[PDB]
Amino acid sequence: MIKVEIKPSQAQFTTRSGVSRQGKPYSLNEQLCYVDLGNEYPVLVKITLDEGQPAYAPGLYTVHLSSFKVGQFGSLMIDRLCLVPA
Amino acid sequence: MIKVEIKPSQAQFTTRSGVSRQGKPYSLNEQLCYVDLGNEYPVLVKITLDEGQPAYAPGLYTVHLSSFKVGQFGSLMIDRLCLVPA
């Protein structure tokens, strides 16, 4: 259904960090990918990995149902995009 | 990929209206459906129809790619969920 691609130039992440409101240090790892939204060319999207998960290797993925949730106004929304091999 | 169901009790919409900031009257039509998010039972989601589109009939649908867009922080998000017959 949604086609996601990790290019060889995107095979690993960068880390961003800081301090939580209850003074706890956080760290978020982010990776770039291309999602085909049906336009002439795929679009660049940023994804945030969960703790202990490595960057996805190059290749083709699709989106896991766990990426979605019901939001605060009752409509569906993406929480965090989770990729599974195509 | 995402399974959406319109039940017989949900076969038509309700309308909500008001006035735009540039004084123009609006009207939004909304319908209820069930989306299977993989939990024990499907979850209730509200969808907003586009102008001139009737309520979806009872049955099984999936989600159209046009429901998605890149948001302001570079990550993917749902704009308005668009259903296609399964």
Nearest-CA distance A63 → chain B (Å): 9
Nearest-CA distance B39 → chain A (Å): 10
Residues of A in Cβ contact (< 8 Å) with B73: 46
Q: Which of B38, B43, B77 sits opposite A78 (nearest CB)?
A: B77
For the residues of B18-71, what is the DSSP string, one character each? EE-TTS-EEEEEEEEEEE--SSSSPEEEEEEPPTTPPPPPSEEEEE-GGGEEE-
Q: Experimental method used, please?
A: X-ray
> In whole angstroms, what is the distance from residue B22 CA to residue B70 CA?
27
> In whole angstroms, what is the distance from residue B70 CA to residue A26 CA?
25
Residue type, A24: K
Enumerate domains of chain A plus CATH numbers.
1-86 (2.40.50.140)
Angle at B49 between CA B66 and CA B22, to 5 degrees: 100
CB contact under 8 A, B75 and A81: yes
Cα torsion B70, A83, A80, A21: sign: negative
Cα–Cα nearest to A64, from A44, A42, A76, A79: A79
Q: Which residue has the tokens 């979850």?
A: B43
> In whole angstroms, what is the distance from residue B34 CA to residue A44 CA?
31
Cα–Cα nearest to B43, from B80, B3, B86: B3
Mention every residue, 6+ apart, whose C-beta is less than 8 A from residue B83. Answer: B4, B33, B47, B56, B61, B62, B63, B64
Please say whether the beta carbons of A68 and A78 come within 8 A: yes
Q: Which of B35, B66, B78 sits opposite A78 (nearest CB)?
A: B78
CA distances from A49 to A4, A44, A55, A80 (A): 15, 16, 7, 8
